[PDB]
Amino acid sequence: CESISARPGEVNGVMVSYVAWSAPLGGHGLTNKTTFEFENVSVTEPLVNSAFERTPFNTTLAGSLAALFPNPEGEAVEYEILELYPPVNGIVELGENGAFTYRPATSFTGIDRFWFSINGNVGEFVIAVDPAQGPQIAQPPFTPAVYVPLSRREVNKQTQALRFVLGVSPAAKPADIYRLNIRQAAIDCEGNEYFHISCYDISIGSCG
Amino acid sequence: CESISARPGEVNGVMVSYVAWSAPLGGHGLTNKTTFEFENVSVTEPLVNSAFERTPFNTTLAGSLAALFPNPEGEAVEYEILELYPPVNGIVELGENGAFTYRPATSFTGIDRFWFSINGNVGEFVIAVDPAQGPQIAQPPFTPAVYVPLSRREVNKQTQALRFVLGVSPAAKPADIYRLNIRQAAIDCEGNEYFHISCYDISIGSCG
Amino acid sequence: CESISARPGEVNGVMVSYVAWSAPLGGHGLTNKTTFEFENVSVTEPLVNSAFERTPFNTTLAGSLAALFPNPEGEAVEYEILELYPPVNGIVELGENGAFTYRPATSFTGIDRFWFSINGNVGEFVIAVDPAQGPQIAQPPFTPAVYVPLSRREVNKQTQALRFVLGVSPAAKPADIYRLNIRQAAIDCEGNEYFHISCYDISIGSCG
Amino acid sequence: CESISARPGEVNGVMVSYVAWSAPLGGHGLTNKTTFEFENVSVTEPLVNSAFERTPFNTTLAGSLAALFPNPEGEAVEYEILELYPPVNGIVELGENGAFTYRPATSFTGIDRFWFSINGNVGEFVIAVDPAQGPQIAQPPFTPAVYVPLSRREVNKQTQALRFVLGVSPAAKPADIYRLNIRQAAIDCEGNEYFHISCYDISIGSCG
Amino acid sequence: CESISARPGEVNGVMVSYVAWSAPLGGHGLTNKTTFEFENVSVTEPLVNSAFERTPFNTTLAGSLAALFPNPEGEAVEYEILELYPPVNGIVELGENGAFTYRPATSFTGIDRFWFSINGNVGEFVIAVDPAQGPQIAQPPFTPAVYVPLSRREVNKQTQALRFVLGVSPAAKPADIYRLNIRQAAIDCEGNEYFHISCYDISIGSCG
């Protein structure tokens, strides 16, 4: 179980070499049939809830963050906006008691995000801007704690190597650990398949 | 948390190299999407209040510094003007008991500043000189203790380096500490975005 | 039962090393998730009572300390304010025969404290500055004799060490003794847990 | 309780090192947030009274010291002026049987002092010179027996050391004892504070 | 705080090199925007008063030095003229008991100076010779203890150095100390400013 270290919000690349395994088999070597699987070993349940909302074309959106924190006690609450992760196609504004305003850019249509903090807990809020005319936009899934975009993958068949992108969401909590499984395929000279399995441990770090 | 040292009234430049990180990813490298965030780890509340005031075109301005020091005691007071920070487009005169006079230069129109000291506490005072004809000039925001002018920023794509300007206001109190977060982006050959996060500690020094 | 000596008004911090226990288990080691409990062995009940009050925005407050000393016996009394622990957002003035006046700083809103002494005993007084507009602020709990801030706690995975902060209120009486229990969790390579239990005795000291 | 020996009329200064306490805590070290308190253990009440008076601009002053010695017995008296501590902005002349005259320097305004002796006891006399064409100057407080100027204080972050300036008034009676308490603050890497308390006993010395 | 040694009556040059600071920033480097400030740390108040007087064209002037020494207590006095500092456009003559005569040269019009010593205390006396026809000549300010003529200043942009002239008045008293603050500006390649701050201590000395 090879070890990897990641920091919340960072996005990094990973490379693995397969020459030692594919070379003696002969033939073409690797093939584009990689499969990824994620498993939890130590994950801390989040204490806040993500949310999704819609708005029509060129309309300011308003809402509240109060309903997204289901604390069991009437303890003091203070809200905040993570400035390192500003929305791409809009501007957010934080009021008081969790009230906020979103101001979409002119002629924009799509999905936008911003991250909020409540008593140190982090969560995701997704906004979809409907077009002026046409059907509603589908709700997209929330971003996992750690993910690998399956479309963003390649194999350098000229030297039997594999590269992919590893992404950590800002919501990941430090000291948690995740496991990744990779099953890779290869083809002999006669045109028949082989396989290989390996795993990696990802542990969330921090600064210092 | 890399450490930086700064002195009140100084403006200095900082450079950070990214070759070690973006070199193996390939492609163009840095993509000019930096974002900055400031945090307070140990800041002392100011004991004086800044102020903003207006004057008509070619009109001498008169005011008082007494109202800007809300001490809760009848302790003795004394007013002074920091000569190292003279106004750019005018001349200031200090009277008795905090009475001061500002004499704008001929045909000047804009924002001008000067810094004053009350019983050892530093503060900012802003003056806006209205034009002869036209609408009023907007009130600008006050000068933070430490700031990075975001209009000034560049990335040397030929060598994967970033440069910015770090400026400390004269009002910064020594022995305080501030934290700066930087999030930088890069694009590989296939268009996958990568991100990098770092932080620096800024502590206020002094002479000796 | 390891022995710890603490002084009133102190905040010290403690570190415990688990390498002798967690290293041979293999796996990943410590996994955060600790629990603390406090038990009494010898405690002397206070002879004075704490109190709480509210004041409107920018409104001076007044009161008397005489009602907080339920002495059944008949003896003379004298009052005093502990100047070593001054309030952070106001100024107090001890009056005649238990009278006092609290003058909040301009524009303040929140909670404030100051510690008073009656005939050699010690107690707490809590004052709340209500905001000018909006809902009122809830009552906070009184500070225990000894407490462990749960947010100031970390585990180092490189050396398998735990750090936490121990603080003693000024009201703690010398020669008292408390007991602290710690339960630390560690995990194997697959996510299953181990547990370790230890306890410490805390005795209140003094100067010399 | 470390022991300090001080002589009347002296100003010495002290230095204490906190490396042995704050070094293992990591973090940022000291914070420059000390607090000082004085307590009596053995103090002898003075047998003479201090006084305060006012005088117009460039106007000579006269008075008598006889009223400042409330001796309930009947004994002979004699007066003296301590020349080791002369006034800084005037001249004094001891008259007949407690009479004296103060002749301020031309164009002076402010506060001035001189220390007198009656039958071996010591006291203070404060004289104020009002401005010619302005509001009267406020009465200043008398100098305590021992004091610590709170503006002449600093912490050296390079070696974790604190400096303050201890001073003794000429009127301190030998063989007296005072106790000084100090509470010092240090911060971790995130801004949370640690606290430390210590005390010292100051005993008034003499010549030999 | 770099140290500088100065002697009364001396005028000397000072040079400071900025190549180590402005070189890495690029662009033009230094700019003509230097600002100077002088602060007192240990100054002895003068015991004599300067004076200023005027005379018409080609008329001998007579005066007295007696009124310029307001000694409070009567004591023997003696007057002298410092011959190392002769007037430029006239000749003086010292009589008895402070009586002196000034005899301007023919066709001279302007300001002339000479320095006098009363019982060991040094002073300045300024004479203005009015023209035959025209308005009166304005009274110029007195000579400070230490001064820097701001007109005489240059920056060697070809090698990034700054030169200025430091002059010591004959009236300066040994063992005194003054502090000088210098703020110098610089401009980057893109055309935006940087600043640098430094200070020096000037102590009056002598020779033996």
CSV table of N, CA, C and O in Angstrom, one decimal, chain E residues 5-10 172-176 203-208:
chain,number,residue,atom,x,y,z
E,5,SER,N,29.6,60.5,14.2
E,5,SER,CA,30.2,61.4,15.1
E,5,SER,C,30.4,62.7,14.5
E,5,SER,O,30.8,62.8,13.3
E,6,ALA,N,30.0,63.8,15.2
E,6,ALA,CA,30.0,65.1,14.7
E,6,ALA,C,30.7,66.1,15.7
E,6,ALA,O,30.7,65.8,16.9
E,7,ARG,N,31.2,67.2,15.2
E,7,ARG,CA,31.9,68.1,16.0
E,7,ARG,C,31.3,69.5,15.8
E,7,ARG,O,30.9,69.8,14.6
E,8,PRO,N,31.2,70.4,16.8
E,8,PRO,CA,30.6,71.7,16.6
E,8,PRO,C,31.4,72.5,15.5
E,8,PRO,O,32.6,72.4,15.5
E,9,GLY,N,30.7,73.2,14.7
E,9,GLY,CA,31.3,74.0,13.7
E,9,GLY,C,31.8,73.3,12.4
E,9,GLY,O,32.4,73.9,11.6
E,10,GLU,N,31.5,72.0,12.3
E,10,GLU,CA,31.9,71.3,11.2
E,10,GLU,C,30.8,71.0,10.2
E,10,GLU,O,29.6,70.9,10.6
E,172,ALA,N,25.9,73.8,19.0
E,172,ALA,CA,25.6,72.5,19.5
E,172,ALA,C,26.5,72.2,20.8
E,172,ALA,O,27.7,72.6,20.9
E,173,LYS,N,25.9,71.5,21.7
E,173,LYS,CA,26.6,71.2,23.0
E,173,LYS,C,27.1,69.7,23.0
E,173,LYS,O,26.3,68.9,22.6
E,174,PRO,N,28.3,69.5,23.4
E,174,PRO,CA,28.8,68.1,23.3
E,174,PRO,C,27.9,67.2,24.2
E,174,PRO,O,27.2,67.6,25.1
E,175,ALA,N,28.0,65.9,23.9
E,175,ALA,CA,27.3,64.8,24.6
E,175,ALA,C,25.9,64.7,24.3
E,175,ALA,O,25.2,63.8,24.8
E,176,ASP,N,25.4,65.6,23.4
E,176,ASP,CA,24.0,65.5,22.9
E,176,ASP,C,23.9,64.6,21.7
E,176,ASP,O,24.9,64.3,21.0
E,203,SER,N,25.9,62.0,17.3
E,203,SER,CA,26.3,62.4,18.6
E,203,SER,C,27.4,63.4,18.5
E,203,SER,O,28.4,63.2,17.8
E,204,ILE,N,27.3,64.5,19.3
E,204,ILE,CA,28.2,65.6,19.2
E,204,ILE,C,29.5,65.2,20.0
E,204,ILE,O,29.3,64.8,21.2
E,205,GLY,N,30.6,65.4,19.4
E,205,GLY,CA,31.9,65.0,20.1
E,205,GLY,C,32.8,66.2,20.2
E,205,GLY,O,32.4,67.3,20.1
E,206,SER,N,34.1,65.9,20.3
E,206,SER,CA,35.1,66.9,20.4
E,206,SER,C,36.5,66.3,20.1
E,206,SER,O,36.6,65.1,19.7
E,207,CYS,N,37.6,67.0,20.3
E,207,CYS,CA,38.9,66.5,20.1
E,207,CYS,C,39.8,67.0,21.2
E,207,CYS,O,39.5,67.9,21.9
E,208,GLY,N,40.9,66.2,21.4
E,208,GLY,CA,41.8,66.5,22.5
E,208,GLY,C,43.2,66.0,22.2
E,208,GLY,O,43.6,65.8,21.1
